[model samples]
Every structure is written in C-alpha cells, then in structure tokens.
Target: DKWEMERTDITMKHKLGGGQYGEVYEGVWKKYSLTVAVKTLKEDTMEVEEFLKEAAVMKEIKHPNLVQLLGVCTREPPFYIITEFMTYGNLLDYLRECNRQEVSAVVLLYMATQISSAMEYLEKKNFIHRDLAARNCLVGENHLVKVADFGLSRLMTGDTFTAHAGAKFPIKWTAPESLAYNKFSIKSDVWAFGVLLWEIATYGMSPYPGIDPSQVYELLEKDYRMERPEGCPEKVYELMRACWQWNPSDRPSFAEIHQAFETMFQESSI
Candidate 1:
C-alpha cells in the first residue's frame, strides 16, 4: 500500500522511450502537483515474483544520486512504475547534446563525483550493479545526476554471481573476468565505472570506439586500455586508470573513488 497509486492520478505527457521492459513517459502526479516518470509495463515481459522484488528494492533504497521511486499502479492492465522525472533525461544524451557548449572540467568532474557517491552507496550495501554506464544514469535540473536502471542489479549472496541464460551485457563495458567467467562483483562494477568515466571525460563518446565487442576480451588480456580523452585532466584519467585495474582486488573501491572525486572537484573549484 505504501507505493500504490491510483491510475487516474497520473497524466502522461512526452514519450521518453520504450526501454528494455516497457515504455516510459514524462508525466505528472496530478494529485501531488509533481512531475514524474511513468513506465508502463508489457504484461508478459517479466515474472510476477521478480517484479515484486524489484519494486521492493526500488522502494527501500534512497540516496541523492539514486532515482527515487514515487509510486506505482499495478492493480490493472498497463501497470506503471512511477518515479521522479529527471529534467535532463539520461546523461548520455545530455552530454552529447551539450558537448558543443561552454562546459568546464569542474562540472564534468562533479557529475562523476555524483555517480561515484551513488555507487558508493550501493557498494556499501553489497549490491552489485551489473550495468553502470552513462546511458543508464539520468540527469535532473542543475546538473544533478542519478543512477537509474536496476534490472541487472543483484545483491551479493556469498559473492558468486551467475547471469541468467541468454543474458547479454554491454561487452565493451564489462570486465575481462566477467566476460570469461560470468562473474560479477562490486569490483566488476568498478570496471564499468571506469568506462563510464571515459564517457564522461569524452563528453559521452562511445567506449572502445571502432573496436568490435568481440575484440574487448583479447585487448583487455593484452593490457590494452583506452587512451586519455582529448583535453581531459591527467588526474581524472588517472582515476579512470585506477578503476580499470585488471585485477579486481587491485582496483580502487567505490568509497575510495568517491573520496578522490570529491577532493578533485573541490580542489578544482578553488
């Protein structure tokens, strides 16, 4: 009952996009006079049991850089998942469109810090975000960024993780161990974050540009890492390098990364 909402309360507006599970819209919670995001489900797209758990996960966690679930309408057909509507949509689109504008290094680093804070929260909770990329993060007003999309997130249970059959991940963003072993951990998520940092530094450029996904594994094995993006600060690229350490244990933890980003952002401002 806590998250339940009346279908009539919502007024769908602009179409966001049909995501992996359903079509999402920019809408309003009329009763509350709040702009919101409404994701309408396709009846057969997911298992009832899994959705219940996902909803629980969504409702339970709350952090500044994590998207907040506002309400849901699930009693009838066209079930909806309502959350706070991000003003700027996803980070990927925002960065690409704004790349031509007068952007500063500090602002970009601040965005990175926001995501690191969110990831640190999930890391502290022992949650493994199988997907952590620019495309999965949404941006709100004033450059606020929140990590979204939890369809691939799973909490740790004795540390070993196996993906569902036929599951496909972003090959270029995945860690080498994950590619070979189906193994996922907060550390693997760090690998993805490194790629995400690359996207941020490059103003949302695609990772491993012009390189086939099939080549990622071998390239990684040979110690190949992306070159620093043009005009990127040495410190920022260094943090990315730290996150991309081949050995998971050798990679910096989310908390460490978050602290580093905070210090970097603060020092850059002064």
Candidate 2:
C-alpha cells in the first residue's frame, strides 16, 4: 500500500485560499484521472519527513466519513500530502456563508451522525483528534461531509485551532483537565465535539459568544455551559450537554454518541 504520488503526474490547478503556507492547491492526479487536494510545503526537510509518516497513517484510514488521504510526494524539496478534494470546502465557512433558512434539521442531524462516525473510528483505533471542531470538517457534493485533519496537526500549517490563529490554545473547545494539564484523551475530543455540535446548530457561530477565551477555563470550572442554540432540538441539545460533562468518565463514548445520533437521524428522517 505504498501510495507514493509522482510529482510529475500531479497537475497543480488554481490556488485554493488557505490562510498561509504550506499552500493548498486543486490538483489532478493524472494516474487515476481524479481531482485531488494537494498540500505543498517548500524547503522543510524536517517537516517533510514528519508529514510522510502521518500520510502513511492516513492512507490506512479508509473511512467514508474521513477525507481520504490518497498519497504523498516526499522525495522532492516541495513535499505534498494529497487527499480527497472536498468541493464546498470546510463546514464552518459553508455554514456561515450558506442560506441558513433553507437548512433542515434532518440534514443537520445527518451531519452530526457522519462526524460522530468518523470520531467513532478514531476512538476505536485509540487515536485522539487533539483538535475537533466544525472547521476541521469539509463538505463534498453539498450535503456530503467528511472529517479532515485528524491527528495531523503538523500537516495543517494553513489551518489554525485558536479560532483561526493569532491566538494560543483552543480554550473554547478544550476540556477542563486538558487545559490544566495539557493532557488530551478521547474524552477531551468529545468535549470539543460538544462545542462543534453547538457550532452546527448555530450556523457556525463561535462557541461561548461574547465570552473571552481567557475566561473559558475559569467559567467551565464554575460549570458554565453554553445555552442551547435557537431552534436546536431538545434531544440534540441533550446529547451535546452529555458530551460536556466535566469529568471524563461521565462523558459518553463516541461509540455511544454515534449510535445515539444515528437513532436521532433515523427518527428525524420520518
């Protein structure tokens, strides 16, 4: 399964607006005659080696809910980590830019369940996302969604976790113990998933609106959870609230969350 991408075969297309380097491009994998997303990094042998390792790991993950990692070009000065090209880009931007009025609760339910399916895969593999948010997901043919940037923080040089960078730490999505001890587990990721669900429910608004990132830790200690988003279903809110339990042991596993959301999606469809 050595999916080493040949640079000469990849035709780079128009620039995709990623905040900064390493730049993202809409590329064509000539071998497969398929369109793909290429993350090209320049002049960093150190990063190239690390990205290669992550790329191999990503290739083994063949879940439909995850943006597929096709291959990597690591031999040259400019390294590339190629993945499935998502048509509509990330979920956060899509939600913010789209007509919210046309969005249905059933569609939103499908999204949460899809994301949870990806999380469930990672959880079963004993992998922690370390960062999980709506911004980390990408959209395909409109309703199509797939979780991206999982356990590949170093590869996402253009993406930022601190509410789009220029700040330190993702306080709003971080769990209490992780903030204090710099420890991250599946439970911490579950906490972030709770925030992500809220983001979905609220059309991609930032969590803890009007509250400073500085205040998040202390406020969580005081058991201050965000109020339910307007028009959010009671059961959906209930699952999200369960994800935010301060104690990790109290939080439901992604397996349970996925099954719960699947149930909700099925119920909502009727």
Candidate 3:
C-alpha cells in the first residue's frame, strides 16, 4: 500500500526526523525536480480525532510562508502527509552556524519580517500555532522561511476552553499563562514568538536556563520571566518582554508585533 500514491508517485527517501506522530522523509513529486517532505504516521499516532480535526484545520489554511500540502493518505496501510520541501531543514540547525556579529541588520530584518508575516497569516485565519518555536520553522533554499508542523495547531472560534492545572508541557518556550494553567490563546502564541525571536537572535540557545520545568511553577509563581541573551538589541528585548507579559491580554497581537519590528528595522541598524 505504501508504494501507491494518489496524485503523484511521491517516492519516499530516508527518514528526516521522528516525533510522537511518526517519521518524516525527503521525497520528490513525479516528473518534477522539486523536492518534498513526507510525514508518515502510525495508526495509533493519528488517532481518529487528531487526523480528522487537524486535517480539516490544515486544509483551510494556505499562505506563501506556510508549507503547501500536496496530498494525504488516510485510506491505506501507510498514512502520510506530503508538503513542500525545505532545503535548510529546521531553524535551529541553520542558526547553529550563524553568528550575531556576522548576521547583518538587513538579514535579520528580512528573517523577522518573513516569520512575522507567517504568524500574521495564521492569526488572521483564527488559528493558534500552539507550538511556535524555531525548530518548527523550516528554511527553504531561497532563504525564505516557511512555518511547518501542525501537529499541535488548533483553530479557535471563540469557544470556551479550559486547562488542567499542573499539566506539564514543553516549558522552555511556553508563555506565562500556559506555564500557570495550560491556558493559551493568540496571546500565548505571541509569547512563544517572543521566545523564538530570542532564539534566533542568540543562535538557538536554550530559552530559560538555571531552572527546570518542575522548578518553573515556583519561579513563575514569583513572576520571573526568561532573560534576553547577551547582545540582543534593546528594541527586540523590549518586544520579547511585551509578549511574555503574565497577563495574556497584555501581549501584543501578531500585527502589532510585525509593526513594531518593522519600525525598529527602519529606524535603526539593529
């Protein structure tokens, strides 16, 4: 069944990465030089609710900075999701070789602009990328960044939502509200974006140091937030703080974030 494909031949290659969902690989569409990424999942990973709901949500999303969904296979022995290929892999890996001194202001501005544009697109669609860290942002050969990975993404329609206290999650990039009660909103995503900004600026250093997730409860209970890395611009640092505000409502929206960064880029050499 894995040999058959619906739209194109989609020859799968070696594994690219693995997650709770399943494995990913590099592949190419039939009769095309363009490469693609294929995420294959085990039946248990693609629980009925997850596969249906997430698929529906992704189907409605389309943007230049978002990966293009070529096709999906739900009727067979191998469940797969095919998307546009990103040559540079994850943002973290690419940032590993970058230096703050080597990165020009203009280049950093371009990167921020692309990422903000992608986030703005998602916000407009009423989608919250529950996981918006550097690792999930894929870089293409042309240096364009595309938002990838929708495993934890969700659509919001103003419905009431609740979270269980003490439910630990990926804490490093989590917002203040999420750390407190697993609560999230567009504001929470903005908070994640702030952490992501610092990650890029610092060449992917860990967001919070000297504290573990278990310790976060007490540390955050006292109103502590992650600190900016050395050499991070004052303007960018301010923006990160604005996004990491304890009160979800205090965080700036994606549009506001884009505007702020754009202004800083235009006004200074940072």
Best first by lDDT, ranked:
1, 2, 3
Q: Locate the minimum summed-lDDT window of 10 residues in model 2.
A: 154-163
lDDT of candidate 1 over 194-259, digit per residue (tens): 999999889889999999888889999899999999989888899889888988899998999999
TM-score of each: 0.94, 0.90, 0.87
Q: Counting only residues 3 or more apart in sequence or on different chains, how many pairs clash (N, Cα, C under 3 Å) in candidate 1?
A: 0
Per-residue error for 269 in candidate 1, Å, reads: 0.6
lDDT of 3 at 121: 82
Q: What is the TM-score (0 to 1) of candidate 2?
A: 0.90
Clash list (residue pairs), candidate 2? none
Model 2 residue 212 lDDT?
89
List the global CA lDDT of all models: 0.85, 0.82, 0.74
lDDT agreement of model 3 with the native? 0.74
